[PDB]
Amino acid sequence: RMFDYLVPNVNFFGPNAISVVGERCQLLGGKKALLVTDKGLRKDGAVDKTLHYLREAGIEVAIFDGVEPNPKDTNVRDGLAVFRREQCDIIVTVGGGSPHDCGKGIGIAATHEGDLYQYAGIETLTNPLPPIVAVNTTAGTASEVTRHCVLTNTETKVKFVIVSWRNLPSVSINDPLLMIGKPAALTAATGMDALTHAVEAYISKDANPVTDAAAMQAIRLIARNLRQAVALGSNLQAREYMAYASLLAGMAFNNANLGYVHAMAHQLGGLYDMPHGVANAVLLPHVARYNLIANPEKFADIAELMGENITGLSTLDAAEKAIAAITRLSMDIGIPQHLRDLGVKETDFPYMAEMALKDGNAFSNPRKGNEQEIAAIFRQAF
Amino acid sequence: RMFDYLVPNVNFFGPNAISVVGERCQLLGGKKALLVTDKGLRKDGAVDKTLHYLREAGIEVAIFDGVEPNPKDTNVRDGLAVFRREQCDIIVTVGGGSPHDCGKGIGIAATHEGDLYQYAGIETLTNPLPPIVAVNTTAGTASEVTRHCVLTNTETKVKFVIVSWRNLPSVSINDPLLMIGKPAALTAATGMDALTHAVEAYISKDANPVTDAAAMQAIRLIARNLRQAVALGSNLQAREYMAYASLLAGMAFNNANLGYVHAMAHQLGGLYDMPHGVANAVLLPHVARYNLIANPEKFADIAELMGENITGLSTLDAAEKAIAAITRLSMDIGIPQHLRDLGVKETDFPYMAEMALKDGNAFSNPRKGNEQEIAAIFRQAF
Amino acid sequence: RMFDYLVPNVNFFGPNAISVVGERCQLLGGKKALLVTDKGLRKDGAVDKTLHYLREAGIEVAIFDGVEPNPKDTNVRDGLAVFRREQCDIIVTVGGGSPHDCGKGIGIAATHEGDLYQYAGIETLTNPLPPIVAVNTTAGTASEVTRHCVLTNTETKVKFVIVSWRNLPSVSINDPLLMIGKPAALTAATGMDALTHAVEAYISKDANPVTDAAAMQAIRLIARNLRQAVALGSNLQAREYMAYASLLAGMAFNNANLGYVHAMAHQLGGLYDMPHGVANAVLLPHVARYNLIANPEKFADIAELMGENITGLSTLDAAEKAIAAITRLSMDIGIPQHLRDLGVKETDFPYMAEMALKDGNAFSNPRKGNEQEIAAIFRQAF
Amino acid sequence: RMFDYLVPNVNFFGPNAISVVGERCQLLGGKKALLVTDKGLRKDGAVDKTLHYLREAGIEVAIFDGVEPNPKDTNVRDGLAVFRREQCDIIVTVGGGSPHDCGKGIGIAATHEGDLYQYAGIETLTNPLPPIVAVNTTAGTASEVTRHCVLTNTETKVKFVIVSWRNLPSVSINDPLLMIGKPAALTAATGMDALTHAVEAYISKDANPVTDAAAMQAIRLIARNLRQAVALGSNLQAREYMAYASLLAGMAFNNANLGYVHAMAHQLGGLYDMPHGVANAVLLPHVARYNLIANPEKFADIAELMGENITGLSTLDAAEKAIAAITRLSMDIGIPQHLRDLGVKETDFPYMAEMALKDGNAFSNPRKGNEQEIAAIFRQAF
Numbered sequence A, B, C, D: 001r002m003f004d005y006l007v008p009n010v011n012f013f014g015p016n017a018i019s020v021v022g023e024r025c026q027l028l029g030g031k032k033a034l035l036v037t038d039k040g041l042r043k044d045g046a047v048d049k050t051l052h053y054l055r056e057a058g059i060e061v062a063i064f065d066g067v068e069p070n071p072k073d074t075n076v077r078d079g080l081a082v083f084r085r086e087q088c089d090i091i092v093t094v095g096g097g098s099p100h101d102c103g104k105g106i107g108i109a110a111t112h113e114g115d116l117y118q119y120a121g122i123e124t125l126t127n128p129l130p131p132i133v134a135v136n137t138t139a140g141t142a143s144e145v146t147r148h149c150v151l152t153n154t155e156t157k158v159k160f161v162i163v164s165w166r167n168l169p170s171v172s173i174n175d176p177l178l179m180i181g182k183p184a185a186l187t188a189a190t191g192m193d194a195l196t197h198a199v200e201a202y203i204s205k206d207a208n209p210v211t212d213a214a215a216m217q218a219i220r221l222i223a224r225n226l227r228q229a230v231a232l233g234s235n236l237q238a239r240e241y242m243a244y245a246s247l248l249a250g251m252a253f254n255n256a257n258l259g260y261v262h263a264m265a266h267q268l269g270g271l272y273d274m275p276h277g278v279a280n281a282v283l284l285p286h287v288a289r290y291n292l293i294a295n296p297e298k299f300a301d302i303a304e305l306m307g308e309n310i311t312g313l314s315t316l317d318a319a320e321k322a323i324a325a326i327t328r329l330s331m332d333i334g335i336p337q338h339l340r341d342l343g344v345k346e347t348d349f350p351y352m353a354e355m356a357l358k359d360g361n362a363f364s365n366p367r368k369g370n371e372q373e374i375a376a377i378f379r380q381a382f
């Protein structure tokens, strides 16, 4: 009946947006910055650019590149050792989801009483984190705009979530010039992740008109730009729109939550460490069809948003076109269409399905299923 | 080429969203609140609710209801004394635009070398304000979401603006249950203010895909709800949508700015002190038609968004329908169609145009004009 | 949010439906009947038919005919006097609106302590009335299916209403064979009265899907049958469908209430005592246009229900066609178009409008108006 | 040529409509209720709700929960024993069809001398029953609004029906808040039972425009909500709309009767004791195709009612779309499509056809068949 809508205070997007990193640290009060990034991204001009604007604005910088794909709690432990030994004032995360998830963890662990795993759950944080300037490199996760901090436990080998308004970065930066170097396959997976965020947020039980505003636009932008962005990575106009789309999808799903697509994709990531992007892609249209009966009117909307002609059609028929439209986009941009080829096996369906209902994202799915109905979705996508 | 996007960190909307004010002050550290409001709102059951939930969460309160319809520099001063003498920690603003502006001004003055004018202009603020929670009771202004602080200088009899990311409230609240008591004519005017925010933001030189997400949905929401809401204030559903519409329109124009409608409306409100909502409403269609040639494609979008059938028409014809649609909506809800009836006089046109050209809102208008062209628009609205 | 839906327990309709009056009096335990009717109807064949079947089933009868157009309170006294002296067990009403109100009044006065006017208002009745078998003769009022009883207070001159589930007749009878003799003007007026019941109930604040089932079908029936009915009274099919329409519109309005049409129609009957049917008729399209902004979507349904082609149209344009259709039907059947022609004076509007805003039927109107706005509608129908 | 139309005097529906059970028992003169229910419903909150409001209203209550799915005469015996032993005044049934038929049966046995099977047939009852308040729990049977009481003869093992106006419950209550807990499969089967009531009544020999009004809206509502209701039972709007739909389908079929779908369903219920709703659903599209030639116009209507596009089509082609729309809905909600999978045997068809031809509902079917043809329908549904 009532909703909250969280989003970073100050956000920057457009080509050359990276040029504000240094300036926005001066305004936040940051003297020294912990730059949190990947081993991969650290050798060209991505971390190098923010590193240039940081020293230009007179901000000292100790870097932490020890962030694994799937951010670990020991990554926060080792990361916090730098923040404390080098005495950093501000956190600058640069990369995809992983650097962002880790920078927040460091912010939490540096500000909240010893240990890290104990603060898992809802609004359970007491004191403000150190300022975080999250410069985002991927048109997919939108973590730079999210309330969510998800790390992986070393002890239990199971991920945990910390959901707090205090995890909202102080400033977000989305510069498409930093994204040009993404290989086609990667821009496709991150692109479908963004799509998945948009439709799941659009059809979520927690969907509202304010959230819809962002989700609808994201779906539209993705449908007009994802193909062209994977076609030619140097296409700036396409990159820009993909960047805005992903940021919009984030503003949406941060406040409306997701559904079964992520609930199932996290399991594929759990058992096979399949890339989160592709896991969402191959499942999307199968879960979307399953969700269809829950709100065919909004699926009719999705079709229209994706460019489909909808004129003389019953709502159910227009809804159908949304499914087709999603699989057409999926097939055009290279996405593998069957789990059979991603290494997945049929015996792991019951376990994954069981886990999927227990996943945090399942609660907001428009259709309340069971373990058998989820196993049938997997088999349809196999 | 580059864009910023500012929005309050944490936002609440939906029926009964007032119930979080006390809890939200607790999380921001506020021990004693300054309640900034109107004499007319100060009794019934609207500021008593925010006074109730603040009392149940254990926050002490000093009320300042000395806010004028056009927030004055002396209103900030007098309210600051109450902030200082009663020793308040946090600012709760309840009402429409006036309490929110005056609230921000109080926040500024309590934090920056005492003076009004001294800090007018762009990013001129150095220090964080006291936390501000803003409860909005009007589906019109969106000042609870805005970076602007507009006061009037009694020394010069002319208004001034302060623009800062620090003016952004800590929390915004949009409870449609509070708005229900709004009389028909008032909701007609406030609706059109929002409508004006949405289209000016959408066609603005500073518009972008992200900005546009909010503007578009707001036009769709207003086109579908404003009529219903002026017909029957107790219609909760229409009240809900108007609140989101006004809020989204705020997320749009806060970051894409406005244009000639507001530039011209402030002049009507500067002389005949015409209600801001009605000044926008009466001028909207005429400034729309003027701006048409700057972006026909986006005016075609507006027609579509307002529910018009565009199927076989040329862009220009479709643009025409957006103007028609706006004036139909304007007439339906009871807006006076001619400035002549609002006591406006033709001899004042030249001077009004001159001022409009200088107004801060003039720069972002998609069509660059002169005094003669602006004067002629007035003539078309007489 | 919660709704009641009242209707007689047993209802008969169709050609020769009258053939059950006797049998149904037997089943209710009535040994002797009070026949409550008009002087006009009481000789020819109409109360004679009902008389024949009462005799055939062994029920002896005493008849009361002193019912005025607009049933007086004294009419009830005179009816109760016959009810007691003749020792009556059951009450059979035959006629239009009046004999039904008078019948119910007698029923009330016979079972509740000696005085009539004192029982005005909502659920004020404690005791069951004698069984009432209501045989309807006009495709207009639907009083045979209604919880209301409305008599004129002879001492004050003003009408009063007793609203109770205990006013529902035991059995209703709607035999179209009994309506064949109605003059064209009478069938036009009663038909418009039925259409009014239907549209006001459809757009009422108290409307719901159960209620709308009856109203939608009644509008559809009237659109396809009223012209045919006024053109030729001996047309059995047209009389059948009008009889069913009127009954359905009763089932609707009894439970969703009415609106500004009826609140204004009663005032025209209050001063010039215009026939209720024609008053509603001349007001309908004008009050409808005023109500449009409250619910354009439902007015768009009305256009469709009435046989208009809505295909390419925006909702508003579709809603327009509902007004057009109504006034087309009005004109076709010979309803007078201007109040001026019915001896209505302009200086009576301020009083009438004031009185109309207080009428019981005004609270359920979808648009909340006032003195001036309702006066404006009068001037439009002038 | 002449029609009766029976329905409870007073009906409540909408969220929280249960809150009137106690108040309504007071007005019917009831001092001590016999709560007639299932062991299942009887703990949680639904007979608890009616118990709460009964006791709050000062009504004492004895409870009989020995009602079987397929209520036996011996249940009525046992229920009646409690009615008399505990000195009960009024009967309150809460549940689906079972508690209602059993509640009616007890009411009959309480006022009608000797046995049960004796009173089987039409208007065979002479005495009024004790007042009956019926609180409905299922959007399916609509027995709370019906003239029928069907029990099972334990001596003969076959079923019997008592059809009477006196079987009409005094008050029906339809609170969708009480229907939320129904598992997906049940709401689907009860929904399709409602659908079957609506289409059979629409196309029955005994159909008329009063009856059709309720039938049409029930079809429209079911086509717009059943998919949503089975997808998420906590969907309040879909629950409301299904509840109003079932009620309307009841008001329709109670008066227009049913046809071959029910005639054949009862035999599946007889032999395999298949759930009524699923037996109906699996048969609907095949019986509908068989009945098509009796009335292609109304199937064309049914197609349009279920949202199908009929614009270009011949009546026959439009009618075809109704059959497809029915089966599409059935599959969408996970209804089993083949009797082969319900444990049905082929050489039971001859016996089932014989019995279907003798069933009470067979008479009003718009197509007169024989044993071969009915058997041939079973074969198509196999």
Ligand SMILES: [Fe+2]
Pocket: A141, A193, A197, A262, A276
């Ligand atoms: Fe994701």
Ligand SMILES: [Fe+2]
Pocket: B141, B193, B197, B262, B276
């Ligand atoms: Fe404004």
Ligand SMILES: [Fe+2]
Pocket: C141, C193, C197, C262, C276, C280
């Ligand atoms: Fe009337």
Ligand SMILES: [Fe+2]
Pocket: D141, D193, D197, D262, D276, D280
């Ligand atoms: Fe049934």
